[PDB]
Amino acid sequence: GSGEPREEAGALGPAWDESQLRSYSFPTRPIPRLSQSDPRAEELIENEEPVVLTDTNLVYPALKWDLEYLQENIGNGDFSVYSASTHKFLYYDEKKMANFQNFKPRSNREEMKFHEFVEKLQDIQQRGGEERLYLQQTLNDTVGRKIVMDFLGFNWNWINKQQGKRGWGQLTSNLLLIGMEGNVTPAHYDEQQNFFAQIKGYKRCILFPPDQFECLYPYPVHHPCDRQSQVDFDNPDYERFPNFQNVVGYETVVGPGDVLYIPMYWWHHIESLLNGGITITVNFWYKGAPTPKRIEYPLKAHQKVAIMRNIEKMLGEALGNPQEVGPLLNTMIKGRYN
């Protein structure tokens, strides 16, 4: 899996041990941990394969962040805070809830000030409760000046050269992630390039390449859980998702100062280590490089994923109702392509 856990400097003991990792049915192989000076890492990023960069200093001024420093300087803005009854957080598109009334949310969002989220957090911890919170908020301009200069201290020289050397679109947003220990963002894929910059705590990252689409069974494109796996990693229904017995992931554990390149359309399962405290992450999202003019075959796996996405979308608009997409596709293939 994540291999032997790393030893921290000053003989401060192992960063983590295997008992902080949850258990799953599939095998994993390690994502390489390299230096940004190492051309191997430059090659993996160009080939859109994940790599963990150990020395970008991307969010070096942010490494001092904790709950106290942030609450004092983050400002008086509103922060999206997602609550969950269990460790699996259930995210959904609230716009697409119009198409699936038979879908009930179990992880609702709540806007609140940063001091309210910290108050609500220690309230759960002193009460011994089991409710979980996950703060996910795009950084805007309403943030204090001390956090502003921390932001200015990011290694923009390195990441901008990466944005230009790959031909990516410009940075779209910076997402701040403050999660509780044991929190799980279940497997899903994103449509942009991601630099996963870990700040506080450790996160286990399990990635699946786009060519394992048929092993991970994403929800219908019109479903509020579009881009998420239907497979319950904790209780995989092998009768509904038989190819999940063939899935094989890429695994790593990122700590403070580590930066994980999650390529676009790559599945990822992110969990904050059990009994590891709160985790802090900042994501850098870039739109992928524009699709080239000369179409070259064979197609990349992610290009076929985009094709299936658009067939579903266009079929939903053509039939006038997304709920008829399913039966028409079965009509199209039953006894004709299977």
Ligand X SMILES: O=C(O)Cc1cs/c(=N\C(=O)CCNS(=O)(=O)c2ccccc2)n1O
CB of 242 to Zn ion, least distance (A): 26
Q: Which of 99, 185, 228, 229 binds ligand X (CB under 6 A)?
A: 185
Q: Which of residues 230-269 bind its own copies (CB under 8 A)?
A: 230, 240-243
* Residue 283 annotated as lining a ligand binding site: yes
Handedness of CA 18, 21, 23, 28 (dihedral sign): negative
C-alpha to C-alpha distance for 68 and 57, rounded to whole angstroms: 22
Residue 162: which of 140, 193, 134, 204 has the closest Cα? 193
Nearer of residues 36 and 194 to ligand X, judged by Cβ: 194
Rounded to whole angstroms, the Cα distance separating 282 from 271 reads: 15
Instruction: Please check if 126 is assigned to a binding site.
Output: no
Ligand-binding site membership of 193 (annotated):
no
Phi and psi for 61 in degrees, rounded to 5?
-70, -20
138 marked as binding residue: no
133/231 with CB nearer its own copies:
231
Which range binds ligand X by CB under 6 A, 108-116, 146-154, 184-192, 307-315? 184-192
* Residue whose beta carbon is closest to Zn ion: 190
Question: Can residue 191 be called a binding residue for Zn ion (CB under 5 A)?
Answer: no
Identify the CA nearest to 281 among candidates 210, 226, 200. 200
Residue closer to its own copies by CB (options 290, 298) is 298
Q: Which alpha helices (DSSP H) does 192-300 contain, by range?
A: 213-216
| 315 binds its own copies per the rule CB under 8 A | yes
Binding-site size for its own copies (CB under 8 A) equals 37
Per the annotation, does 166 bind a ligand?
A: no
CA 264 to chain centre: 11
Q: Which is nearer to Zn ion, 135 or 325 (CB)?
A: 135
Interacting positions 259-288 with ligand X (CB under 6 A): 268, 270, 281, 285
- Find out whether 192 is annotated in a ligand binding site: yes
- Strands laid side by side in the 109-113 sheet: 33-34, 51-53, 259-262, 193-200, 279-286, 171-179, 132-138, 78-84, 109-113
Binding to ligand X (CB under 6 A) within 87-126 occurs at: none
Single-letter code of the amino acid located at 84: A
* 177 touching ligand X, by CB under 6 A: yes
Of 190, 222, 229, 224, nearest to 314 by C-alpha is: 222
Contact 82, 89 (CB under 8 A): yes
Residues that bind its own copies (CB under 8 A): 213-214, 217-220, 230, 240-243, 295, 297-299, 304, 307-308, 311-312, 315, 318-320, 325-326, 328-338
Binding positions for Fe cation are: 188, 190, 268
